[PDB]
Amino acid sequence: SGTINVLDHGAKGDGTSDDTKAFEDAWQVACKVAASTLLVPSGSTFLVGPVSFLGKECKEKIVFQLEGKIIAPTSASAWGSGLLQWIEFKALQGITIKGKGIIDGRGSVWWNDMMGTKMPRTKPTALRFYGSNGVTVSGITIQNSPQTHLKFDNCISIQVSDFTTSSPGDSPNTDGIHLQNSQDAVIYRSTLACGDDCISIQTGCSNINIHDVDCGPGHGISIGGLGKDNTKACVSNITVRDVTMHETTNGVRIKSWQGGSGSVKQVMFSNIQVSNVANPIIIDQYYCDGGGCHNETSAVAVSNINYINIKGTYTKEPVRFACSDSLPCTGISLSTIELKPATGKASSLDPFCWKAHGELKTKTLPPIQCLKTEKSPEAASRSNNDACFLE
């Protein structure tokens, strides 16, 4: 009565017939009753193409209970060109996606160039939330995304828990969870196996808390890349605690582009265990993957970044603070860092600091003796206070 099973609205659940129409119809029914649940039942597999579940004409507090499997079409005709997301939830209040079922993007057809006369640089995000207040994602697994697994854009009050991504470590650009223009988020008790950043925090994000997460494979937990194409980025109050990273290319990273502007401030990375991680601790203001590697006079201002209790083994550079000549990093603090080289090659690479100011609160392994204790008039002279933040 209160639970709208998609099979009662025309869905075939055979994996082969297109059930998109049926899902839209079930959504329209669920949208009319509060406390309603749209159930995608266990024991069935549903082929669903691009779809947008709109909240504008819908109700608030809806539950989308995914217990079976939703699979993406592999035919190019299902997608058209320029589509940035497969499944979208837009303008919802209090939406919950829960259950122990699976979203499978069949991403290998995209990674592997089987769509269209031509591969798009940016492929669809599997599950995207836009413009929503009070979003919960729990329980589900997203596997084999065409690109990003889960995205939050312009959302507030987000909770992600008991959540899993699974795409191959060598799949291109398959980041786990991406946030942009989103605030007041908690991501916890989740397992992220990705081909790119496990968690990527982009501009406009603040008050993000990540804890009790396992990453690997993937590229680590990253703020950025910020400021590409001479743009302004603002990120503040990011906490990452109690995370284990296995065979990722970075551990905890902040990356920004030369020519960017704005500010990344008040970041805490604590209780991080790394196992065979290439670059465990990195601030890179020379980031240029996918573009030009020239220098420019503007930078994103990085300040008040704290690293506490980070231990394990590394395979490339243990610590790299590569900050802009035009705007040094400041307020970097390190405590209780115990990193051991996993390979001989790694053992020959010492910490690297460039234009980085801060303090060592304890001795570290390897020793970090390149952080500058003096203040930076250069950093203080660039206006990166009121352009980004009101407090």
Ligand X SMILES: *[C@@H]1O[C@H](CO)[C@@H](O[C@@H]2O[C@H](CO)[C@@H](O)[C@H](O)[C@H]2NC(C)=O)[C@H](O)[C@H]1NC(C)=O
Ligand Y SMILES: *[C@@H]1O[C@H](CO)[C@@H](O[C@@H]2O[C@H](CO)[C@@H](O[C@@H]3O[C@H](CO[C@H]4O[C@H](CO)[C@@H](O)[C@H](O[C@H]5O[C@H](CO)[C@@H](O)[C@H](O)[C@@H]5O)[C@@H]4O)[C@@H](O)[C@H](O[C@H]4O[C@H](CO)[C@@H](O)[C@H](O)[C@@H]4O)[C@@H]3O)[C@H](O)[C@H]2NC(C)=O)[C@H](O)[C@H]1NC(C)=O
Report, in Å, the least distance between residue 236 CB and ligand X: 8
DSSP string of 307-337, one letter each residue: EEEEEEEESS-SEEEE-BTTB-EEEEEEEEE
- Tokens 């100011």 sit at which residue? 357
Say which of 196, 197, 284, 357 is annotated catalytic. 196
Applying CB under 6 A, the site for ligand X has a residue count of 4
Report, in Å, the least distance between residue 4 CB and ligand X: 32
Between 25 and 184, name the residue whose CB sits nearer to ligand X: 184
Does the annotation mark 219 as catalytic?
yes
| Pair 47, 71: CB distance under 8 Å | yes
Between 292 and 344, name the residue whose CB sits nearer to ligand Y: 292
Query: Which 203-222 positions form the footprint of ligand X (CB under 6 A)?
Result: 207, 209
Rounded Cα gap, residues 291 and 312, in angstroms: 32
Report, in Å, the least distance between residue 348 CB and ligand Y: 13
User: Judged by CB under 6 A, which of 26, 322, 349, 368 binds ligand Y?
Assistant: 322
Q: In angstroms, what CA-CA distances link 188 with 102, 127, 230, 370?
A: 19, 18, 33, 34
Is residue 325 involved in binding ligand Y (CB under 6 A)? yes
Between 129 and 321, name the residue whose CB sits nearer to ligand Y: 321
Chain centroid to CA 178: 3
Residue 322 binding partner per list ligand Y, ligand X, none, with a CB distance cut-off of 5 to 8 Å that depends on partner kind? ligand Y
User: Judged by CB under 6 A, which of 33, 114, 370, 387 binds ligand Y?
Assistant: 370
Applying CB under 6 A, the site for ligand Y has a residue count of 8
Cβ neighbours for 254, distance < 8 A, ≥ 6 positions apart = 222, 223, 224, 226, 264, 267, 282, 283, 284, 302, 305
Q: What is the 3-state secondary structure (H, E, C) of 22-65?
A: HHHHHHHHHCCCCCCEEEECCCCEEECCCEEEECCCCCCCCEEE
Between 67 and 184, name the residue whose CB sits nearer to ligand X: 184
| Pair 377, 312: CB distance under 8 Å | no
Torsions phi, psi for 127 (to 5 deg): -135, 120
Report, in Å, the least distance between residue 355 CB and ligand Y: 7
Is residue 161 involved in binding ligand X (CB under 6 A)? no
303's tokens: 């300040």
Rounded Cα gap, residues 253 and 305, in angstroms: 11
Between 37 and 209, name the residue whose CB sits nearer to ligand X: 209
Q: In angstroms, what CA-CA distances link 30 with 49, 123, 234, 293?
A: 20, 30, 37, 50
Is residue 270 involved in binding ligand X (CB under 6 A)? no
| Pair 354, 376: CB distance under 8 Å | no
Rounded Cα gap, residues 94 and 330, in angstroms: 39
User: Judged by CB under 6 A, which of 35, 290, 294, 390 binds ligand Y?
Assistant: 294
Report, in Å, the least distance between residue 371 CB and ligand Y: 9
Torsions phi, psi for 342 (to 5 deg): -85, -25
Residue 237 binding partner per list ligand Y, ligand X, none, with a CB distance cut-off of 5 to 8 Å that depends on partner kind? ligand X
Per-position x/- string for 334-363, each x denoting binding to ligand Y as judged by CB under 6 A, each - no binding:
-------------------xx---------
359's tokens: 């303090």
Between 207 and 326, name the residue whose CB sits nearer to ligand X: 207
Per-position x/- string for 171-210, each x denoting binding to ligand X as judged by CB under 6 A, each - no binding:
-------------x----------------------x-x-
Give the residue at shortest CB distance from ligand X.
207
Rounded Cα gap, residues 355 and 135, in angstroms: 40
Query: Which 225-254 positions form the footprint of ligand X (CB under 6 A)?
Result: 237
| Pair 344, 359: CB distance under 8 Å | no
What positions carry a catalytic annotation?
196, 219
Q: Which residues bind ligand Y (CB under 6 A)?
A: 286, 294-295, 322, 325, 353-354, 370
Q: Which residues bind ligand X (CB under 6 A)?
A: 184, 207, 209, 237
